[PDB]
């Protein structure tokens, strides 16, 4: 059934699973036309498909050409997402295919279920967690690859960098969601926190800076400060 705080450790057991987030698939800018009407212009998007135990991110880039001549794009985007996830599963060896796929929005359930009818043994599940994966386009290297794409493309990342050498996947996922929640709250403050120290760099093969363990504790504390300070200004608490 649904995924929530009661069954949170299930994410880090040894059953292969993937989160699918579709919130950055269909992206637009809204603008005025010369006649003073309003129109949209699509920009490149991405499907965020993440193995929370290993950190493996299957970033399918959605090039704006996929929308050409199509109607009802917000509806199509859900079915295009489900088509690409289904294609990903079919491309994997049987022993690498997921046993469950968790969608971050309930509107993805029927499109993915229908695309996965050939896989009756893969559970398609919703979640009650409010996960901040929409903020993935605030990670500069991910945004860069999406905006530079001239054609459909899949790019593979590890969103945990090398963290699992030193911490568990529960801790790594907790760090990731804290970082993304912060970026979603105040992107500028969050990024200022992450980079303020010029001697801590992001390796070419990494997404985040090379913090020591002691430095991550400080960073995580500062991200918690930034989120609960804003929760209080926002709700006068």
């Amino acid at each position: 059934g649904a995924m929530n705080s009661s069954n949170y450790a299930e994410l880090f057991n040894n059953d292969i699973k993937l989160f699918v987030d579709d919130t950055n698939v269909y992206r637009v800018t809204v603008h005025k036309t010369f006649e003073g009407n309003v129109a949209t212009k699509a920009i490149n998007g991405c499907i965020f498909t993440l193995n929370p135990k290993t950190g493996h991110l299957f970033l399918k880039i959605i090039h704006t050409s996929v929308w050409a001549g199509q109607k009802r794009l917000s509806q199509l985007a859900k079915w295009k997402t489900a088509e690409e996830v289904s294609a990903l599963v079919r491309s994997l060896p049987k022993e690498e295919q997921p046993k469950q796929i968790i969608v971050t929005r309930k509107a993805m359930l029927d499109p993915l279920e229908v695309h996965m009818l050939d896989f009756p043994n893969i559970a398609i599940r919703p979640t009650e967690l409010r996960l901040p994966f929409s903020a993935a386009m605030s990670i500069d290297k991910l945004s860069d690859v999406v905006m530079k794409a001239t054609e459909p493309q899949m790019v593979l990342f590890n969103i945990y960098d090398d963290w699992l050498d030193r911490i568990s996947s529960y801790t790594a996922f907790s760090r990731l969601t804290l970082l993304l929640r912060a970026l979603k709250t105040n992107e500028e403050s969050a990024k200022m926190i992450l980079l303020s120290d010029p001697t801590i760099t992001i390796k070419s093969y990494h997404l985040w800076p090379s913090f020591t363990d002691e430095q991550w504790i400080t960073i995580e504390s500062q991200m918690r400060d930034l989120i609960l300070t804003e929760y209080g200004r926002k709700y006068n608490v």
């Binding site: 199509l76 079915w79 088509e83 029927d110 499109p111 229908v114 009818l117 050939d118």
Partner: protein, 300 residues
């Protein structure tokens, strides 16, 4: 006009014949139903006074044989039986008519309700849904489950309605996932009509039989089948005009006849709101929409 004689009525029971019904008291001198119109299927059904659950009954067509009902005190129900001795049957029906021990099927001459509810229903198709081939009549009750309910437990006592499942490989063509899920015309016209039912008459016959099983016995699985067959049409962008017009008439008379007291357990709010106000056919069921909005505006 045909007759269903009764040996006796040893236990108090409400007896239904099609859309009519009457109370018989314990050991009352009741010996059956006469003047039953020829040309239609019929259903004779029963609820004991002492049974909260278990309305049961028999679908039959008097052109296919001579049938009588007699109480079985071991199995505790009114049983339908077939009489092969036509002389014995003729003899009994006449003695009963002479002593005036039978109720008359009470059809008003203006009244096409039963025809309109059974237009496409044929005994041969009933007997394929209800499998018991040594009898020419078919027993149904409130508890019987459908083949699809058994997939989600006795196969001999099941209702073998056509399985309809909108999230199934039968309903969805590879590479047309969104198209076929949002517009079920392929599933309706190719898979079901051309493939399984062969024509819309057979489809409507199963739809009408499911509704009647659902209304007369409170058979849950039949209710599910009725709504699924409606939803499959309403969710199809491409339906023959004659099918939509006939569907509107079929549903009008079902809603018209529907017992107001049981409307809340017989009508699925989601299906009816989708069909009348969202679906491709939201503007094609004028008669049905008008009677629904005037009789059950709560549901909507």
């Amino acid at each position: 006009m045909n007759t269903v004689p009764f040996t006796s009525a040893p236990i108090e029971v409400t007896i239904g014949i099609d859309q009519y019904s009457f109370n018989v008291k314990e050991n009352q001198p009741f010996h059956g139903i006469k003047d039953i119109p020829i040309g239609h299927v019929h259903v004779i059904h029963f609820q004991h006074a002492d049974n909260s659950s278990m309305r049961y009954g028999y679908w039959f067509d008097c052109r296919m044989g001579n049938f009588y009902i007699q109480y079985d005190p071991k199995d505790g129900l009114y049983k339908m039986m077939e009489e092969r001795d036509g002389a014995k049957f003729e003899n009994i029906v006449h003695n009963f008519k002479e002593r005036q021990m039978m109720v008359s099927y009470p059809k008003i001459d203006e009244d096409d309700t039963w025809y309109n509810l059974t237009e496409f229903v044929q005994m041969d198709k009933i007997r394929k849904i209800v499998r018991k081939d040594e009898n020419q009549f078919s027993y149904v009750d409130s508890s019987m489950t459908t083949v699809q309910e058994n997939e989600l437990s006795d196969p001999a006592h099941s209702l073998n309605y056509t399985v309809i499942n909108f999230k199934s490989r039968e309903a969805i063509r590879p590479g047309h996932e969104m198209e076929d899920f949002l517009d079920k015309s392929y599933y309706l016209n190719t898979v079901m009509l051309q493939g399984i039912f062969k024509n819309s008459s057979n489809y409507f016959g199963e739809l009408q039989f499911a509704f009647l099983n659902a209304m007369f016995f409170g058979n849950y699985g039949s209710s599910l089948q009725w709504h699924a067959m409606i939803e499959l049409i309403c969710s199809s962008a491409t339906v023959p005009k004659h099918m939509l017009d006939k569907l509107d008439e079929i549903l009008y008379y079902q809603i018209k006849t529907l017992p107001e007291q049981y409307s809340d357990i017989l009508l699925n709010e989601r299906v009816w709101n989708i069909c009348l106000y969202s679906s491709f056919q939201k503007n094609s069921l004028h008669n049905t929409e008008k009677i629904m909005e005037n009789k059950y505006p709560e549901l909507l």
